[PDB]
Design a protein around this ligand. Structure first.
Ligand SMILES: Nc1ncnc2c1ncn2[C@@H]1O[C@H](COP(=O)(O)OP(=O)(O)OP(=O)(O)O)[C@@H](O)[C@H]1O
Ligand SMILES: Nc1ncnc2c1ncn2[C@@H]1O[C@H](COP(=O)(O)OP(=O)(O)OP(=O)(O)O)[C@@H](O)[C@H]1O
Ligand SMILES: Nc1ncnc2c1ncn2[C@@H]1O[C@H](COP(=O)(O)OP(=O)(O)OP(=O)(O)O)[C@@H](O)[C@H]1O
Ligand SMILES: O=c1ccn([C@@H]2O[C@H](COP(=O)(O)OP(=O)(O)OP(=O)(O)O)[C@@H](O)[C@H]2O)c(=O)[nH]1
Ligand SMILES: O=c1ccn([C@@H]2O[C@H](COP(=O)(O)OP(=O)(O)OP(=O)(O)O)[C@@H](O)[C@H]2O)c(=O)[nH]1
Ligand SMILES: O=c1ccn([C@@H]2O[C@H](COP(=O)(O)OP(=O)(O)OP(=O)(O)O)[C@@H](O)[C@H]2O)c(=O)[nH]1
Ligand SMILES: [Mg+2]
Ligand SMILES: [Mg+2]
Ligand SMILES: [Mg+2]
Ligand SMILES: [Mg+2]
Ligand SMILES: [Mg+2]
Ligand SMILES: [Mg+2]
Lengths: 559, 559, 559
């Protein structure tokens, strides 16, 4: 096993997840199998309790693991599948040793943070980095560790001490450290003393970095590079200039231009890992596919506008996987994506009493949209706004996708406005009020990867067509409610066909409305299964419907 | 004596000299006598050997001290005069103890950095902070110490250790520390971990800050202030938000808006220093004069353009005192200054063979200029370009000031083009070549404050008029050459009158050319004597000549 | 050049000079030429101003360099001669860069502690480690650097930073670091946390140690060694157990038993330095001579007692070279030395009025003595006591040596008691009092190595015989006075022959008194020229006179 640790810096939120993902993608272009571990110094066992207002969206795994947003970045860049064990947290590792003590597995010794907890960390990283993450049952060749937080924080102290020991418990040339750092630019001068103080913290903590990755608002001056290469004991070829770029799909081709594969191949002896010529064709076949999609990103010009209708649309990280999944669809259509961020509460008429500026900008955006996404939000407070957005799309012929809550607000709209039961509602919003036309009912989270099976009278639908007309759809779930089965044949009598269901048939999972160009809803989250070179089919269908050429896309899918 | 230390930070060049000068100016608005000390952790005895390419211009004192650029900032903001002892350097203080050892004044003890060198530092700061710096023979009430470099550097280690001890060798409430710090803003988020790591270095080194001054590209968010006030054990009222502003004359009125006098008055018991009501009128009379010049900076609109003709005009700090002296003149004329920065070598015709873009932009600027300054540069390599700039101004009637080298290139121009000896030259450029018409000759630097006396037939001149027609001019010198006295009566026969001289008459120090609107030259540097509320008379005369209203200015000066 | 740095620790005065000297002596037993540098973080230019009450005796070099006591330890263990440049101090190196700045040799850059002062240190260590220190004009093969003070002190900061850089400016395998450390033993348990906190300071400062030398009141337990080898990343074979031993001549044979040559030979590639078989015989010929003198130290039993008569005899380090020179004489006679430490002031009768216990213990010791040394002290306050000790030895036939002041008090005794001028005196004690029989007169220190030449009528003397009857004696001087030449032929008429003089004959340097078994005085210090395997001839003559077998020693010297 080789290890690359991506670490620390002057600030949090600097770019370690981007460089970790680019490094893994780049190493994969030598044919190497790459895995990843996120370490988060936070104490939470997993992200499933904590709200999207900190660290962005909760990411959902095939396991049903509700995990760190960084694991989603590794899944999409590398083409890999991760377990809940691939996210280390302070909570998991302190919990592991405490549960092991009360059972007596330390045989009556005193259990100390060094060695015992720092040995639990190294036992975990070795257990987990050998887990299969590809379509093939090979153990990986490289693990990337993203060390969360900043080096020199109390919460990081056990993890840097475990990595200090891991650098020796595993051999040298099986371990490298990349340190990401900030170069401020002040009055036209690029300042080196923040990055120098960060190299002192690594030395203090007993680690040496093999690369410095410098994050800056400019290209680094070669005099600034020389200075960093004087204070840190590294050559000029070991400071990578990682400036601010408009697109993160370009960052792998920045580091390829900067010899970082060529360095790591000589620092980690990567040419001495056994690989076939088949593995070495697959590597450059991924590289040329990356150069293709990045060329097609730069010379594309024709725009498509998608309204994302939700709450808290100012924290754009609360929709990170949705956003990436709209981008992958856009890149496969070769049209420039603009997301129009629409707060659903501002669509409600009462906003015109509260602040007229917010009311009109929301409807200005929703009218401007070539397609609409209701993204699969959290907490029912915006539903009466999203019901307008679903009504607008159905009354007007505008392309629509409804994810999770986007099944539900669309079925609630269709019930109130096409069946004509005007109070019919989400039980999560009203519960004890006991209305008779319950659209949502509870059937205790239904979590992780499940099979969805198409109902037989459904090959007419665009959504079965986009999935290659394969009999089953396997996708990730994070829901507590269903559509009520008693209202299904009522809705189907009116053309709102539940095109796909759970194998038991009690649970409604995909619809398409008859006759509309594209009015699709999924109870799963199709975001989490999106890959950079293979967009998620419901999002590719929305961006194609919004662009025209939905038929030419369905034709290409059918080969 | 009270002490304010202004210190450290995440980066060098952060703003300590601006905040130190603003703090001293602000405290002076309570009637308090304020002094300053710069500590530079560099080893140089004084700046007189080191070139303007690092740390900007060398500043010249009345003593003839060639000192740090920061001492000039204190002189102009506070209205004070400083000795060469007011700049502490590592060289001076290590030299002081080494010279004292070889003489035996430690009486055969081992001389250690702690206590002995750190006691030399505290003996110096007490010796020097009692020196008179005003027009009155009172000892000061407050000393500002600017601690150069960054806290946590090896070169700073003896000075922070001396200040750690000085906080106790002098009482508490006679000492306060202001720490200047950087808040980066990255993806629209203001980052606190660089300022937290800087508070850990102060605690490690045994100092606590009383203010945090946060330097940022935005106003601080109140949540960012709350966070800094959680990690550092200080109230919200002790983080001052010192954002990037277009003008530094505004920075005192920022800190006045932020209660920093009101805090320091309760932290340093400044109301318990004895002062008269006369002292308390003088304080608010300076404050209202500052509010006047800053109001007159904001509502002024009509521009004046001055060409500054020199070398290395890309390092604008190489002309810092010249620049401030043009600004003070501009503020008293109530016209917005634009400095046009003109590289004199680019004015030479050979530049049109080398790069035509540089040739035309230089002459584009010099033609655009309402006035010209030849600023008093260093090293003769640009003189043939400045001779064109002096010719242009004389042939065309454009207002001119020549400082130091600007006497000399103008007299060299007047000799070559109006007397008609076409090879006549600066002996510093040609020496051993032994031409007969030597314009410069040597008469070993003539340094610091000297008297200049007006020749009798000179009250006609604008330059004697601008000086209030007072018989002597006292100004600062830093020159090795003179104009040749054998060429003086030749030049005076042609109207180039040497309006002022040294008391011996051998040495030529001020000219005015007959008939031209303003063609003045000084061998002294009038920059170093410029004050924010009283501009240097030769620069006020140039900016007035460039604006028109030179007569209305001379009238106001004559009262 | 190879470098070994001996460094730091938990406490000052731990044993670095003993381990540095043992390492150099041991490496010399491979035939390698070894040199040494002491770094002292004190500010003094040289030891010649500072009194023996701190850091022990001032050591005198052939240059006339008054230097650190540690340079004497290297001279005697290694068989080498050192210049005043071999002692680096903070004063010398800050003085060097400050003198170089005022002359302009930094060409107008800003001179910073890093790089410029830390480059002066590395330029010095390379300049000086190539200096010839043997009897042959070869440049050395190895330099030992003793880094004075403790690592993590402010005064050490520039020297550890220079050594951090020197580890890379010179290659790896040309540099090794030995760290000396304390293991306390508390309630029968050997404590490792002080040595762990010292390895953290080295990592913080960017150095890794190749050996840990652990100083302890016991042999280290192998569990304690294992623990130190867990926390520091080093094998068990790299912790050397350097326990408290009664004799320092044993410490080389401790480290030879502990494979420290065998480690350093593989860590520094010492087998790849070119050497002849002649060099490899000389190495083991020194080793077997060390095993001989250490065997002859352990199986010797018969005692000899020497009174050392001086001031401040409680600070035994104030006589370190005298003490070692009595030991080398004792080891060559094969008799166990006891120094009886006699305070000369306590010999004065007035002490019997002040404290009778001190009076009788002094005369109890002086009566017990088989020989007497007056050691060459400092400051005249004890002379009237030493005059009794010189009288006692002359009246009683007890063997005597008088060094520096020990010429002078003996001649003052002989004048007062055998010529019979009872007030005759040391001019340094009385000056302005102007007595006529001045024994001392001034002839401005007479410093360093000088030639002394024997007067012709002197081959009868034991002191000319002990020197091999060679015509000149070359020895080190540190005196300001002489014996008066006007009193010489008076003294010689009475049998007190001045057996040796300066080449000019004005200056009296060696005596022997006729008829007494051994009553010798030298104005030079014979201590500084003493070697472990070749004792200084005047001290070997005293210990032989005290033991009997002075004749058998003179016979062995005469071959
Ligand atoms: N080279 C880059 N150029 C521009 N933006 C970048 C670059 N690298 C990262 N970013 C952006 O910075 C933001 C945060 O980066 P990232 O998520 O990698 O942070 P982090 O330091 O790993 O920690 P956190 O998980 O707390 O955000 C994201 O919006 C990301 O797109
Ligand atoms: N509040 C501020 N807003 C905008 N510019 C500022 C502010 N404070 C300082 N500056 C500018 O920052 C630059 C450097 O500031 P300053 O000279 O005070 O730096 P310093 O940290 O004291 O050290 P140095 O002497 O090395 O420059 C100057 O151009 C100054 O005008
Ligand atoms: N292994 C040892 N066993 C016993 N005594 C020792 C040992 N090593 C050193 N010593 C004694 O310790 C004392 C101080 O040791 P040394 O002179 O080497 O100290 P240091 O740490 O180099 O610093 P300093 O020059 O300030 O004394 C001396 O008396 C010396 O003989
Ligand atoms: O105000 C100042 C700034 C600097 N200095 C002295 O000059 C040196 C200049 O160093 P700075 O700290 O100004 O910069 P740097 O070379 O470390 O690199 P950047 O932060 O710009 O990337 C400092 O280390 C200090 O010795 C002062 O004496 N005063
Ligand atoms: O990538 C990350 C970032 C952060 N964290 C965890 O969340 C915390 C968030 O802290 P950050 O370090 O992200 O910010 P902060 O609150 O210290 O303040 P600013 O720098 O933004 O001013 C960190 O201290 C760490 O515990 C991670 O686990 N991973
Ligand atoms: O009073 C105590 C002592 C120790 N301990 C806990 O037990 C551990 C025992 O560690 P100690 O600090 O007692 O010893 P050590 O193993 O570091 O080595 P020596 O200093 O003896 O050479 C400590 O690190 C701490 O975790 C306590 O909880 N309380
Ligand atoms: Mg935060
Ligand atoms: Mg991340
Ligand atoms: Mg710099
Ligand atoms: Mg400054
Ligand atoms: Mg020593
Ligand atoms: Mg223990």
């Amino acid at each position: 096993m080789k290890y690359v640790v991506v670490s620390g810096g002057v600030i949090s939120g600097i770019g370690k997840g981007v460089l970790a993902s680019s490094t893994g993608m780049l190493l994969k272009t030598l044919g190497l199998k790459v895995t990843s571990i996120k370490i988060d110094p936070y104490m939470n066992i997993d992200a499933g309790t904590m709200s999207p207002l900190e660290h962005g969206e909760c990411f959902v795994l095939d396991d049903g693991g509700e995990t760190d947003l960084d694991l989603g970045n590794y899944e999409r860049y590398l083409g890999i599948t991760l377990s809940r064990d691939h996210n280390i947290t302070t909570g998991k590792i302190y919990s592991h040793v405490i549960s092991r003590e009360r059972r007596g597995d330390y045989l009556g010794k005193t259990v100390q943070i060094v060695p015992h907890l720092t040995n639990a960390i190294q036992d975990w990283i070795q257990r987990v980095s050998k887990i299969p993450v590809d379509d093939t049952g090979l153990e990986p060749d490289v693990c990337i560790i993203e060390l969360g937080g900043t080096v020199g924080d109390i919460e990081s102290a056990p993890f840097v001490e475990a990595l200090r020991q891991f650098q020796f418990e595993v051999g040298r040339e099986n371990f490298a450290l990349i340190h990401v750092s900030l170069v401020p630019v002040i009055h036209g001068e690029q300042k080196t003393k923040p990055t120098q103080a960060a190299i002192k913290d690594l030395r203090s903590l007993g680690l040496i970095p093999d690369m410095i990755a410098c994050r800056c608002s400019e290209e680094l001056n070669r005099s600034t590079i020389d200075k960093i290469a004087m204070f840190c004991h590294v050559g000029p070829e070991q400071v990578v200039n990682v400036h601010d770029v408009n697109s993160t799909y370009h960052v792998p081709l920045l580091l390829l231009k900067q010899h970082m594969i060529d360095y790591l191949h000589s620092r980690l002896k990567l040419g001495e890992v056994p690989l076939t010529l088949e593995d070495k064709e697959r590597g450059s076949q991924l590289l040329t596919n990356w150069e293709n999609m990045t060329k097609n990103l730069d010379d594309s010009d024709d725009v498509v506008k998608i309204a994302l209708v939700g709450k808290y649309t100012n924290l754009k990280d609360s929709y990170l996987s949705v956003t990436k999944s709209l981008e992958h669809a856009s890149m496969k259509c070769r049209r420039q994506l603009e997301i129009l961020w629409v707060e659903a509460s501002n669509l409600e008429p009462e906003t015109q009493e509260v602040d007229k500026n917010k009311f009109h900008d929301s409807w200005n955006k929703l009218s401007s949209a070539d397609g609409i996404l209701v993204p699969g939000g959290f907490g029912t407070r915006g539903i009466e706004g999203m019901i307008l957005a679903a009504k607008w799309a159905r009354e007007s012929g505008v392309p629509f996708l409804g994810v999770c809550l986007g099944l539900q607000v669309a079925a609630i709209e269709f019930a109130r406005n096409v069946i004509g039961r005007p109070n019919s509602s989400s039980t999560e919003f009203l519960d004890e009020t006991l209305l008779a036309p319950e659209d949502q009912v509870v059937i205790t989270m239904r979590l992780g990867l499940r099979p969805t099976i198409f109902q037989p009278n459904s090959e007419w639908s665009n959504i079965r067509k986009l999935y290659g007309e394969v009999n089953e759809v396997h996708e990730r779930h994070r829901h507590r409610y269903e559509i009520n089965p008693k209202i299904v044949n009522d809705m189907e009598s009116r053309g709102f066909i539940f095109v796909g269901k759970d194998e038991t048939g009690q649970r409604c999972e995909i619809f398409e409305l008859k006759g509309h160009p594209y009015y699709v809803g999924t109870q799963y989250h199709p975001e989490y299964t999106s890959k950079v070179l293979e967009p998620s089919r419901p999002f590719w269908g929305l961006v194609a419907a919004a662009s025209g050429t939905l038929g030419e896309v369905i034709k290409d899918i059918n080969l």
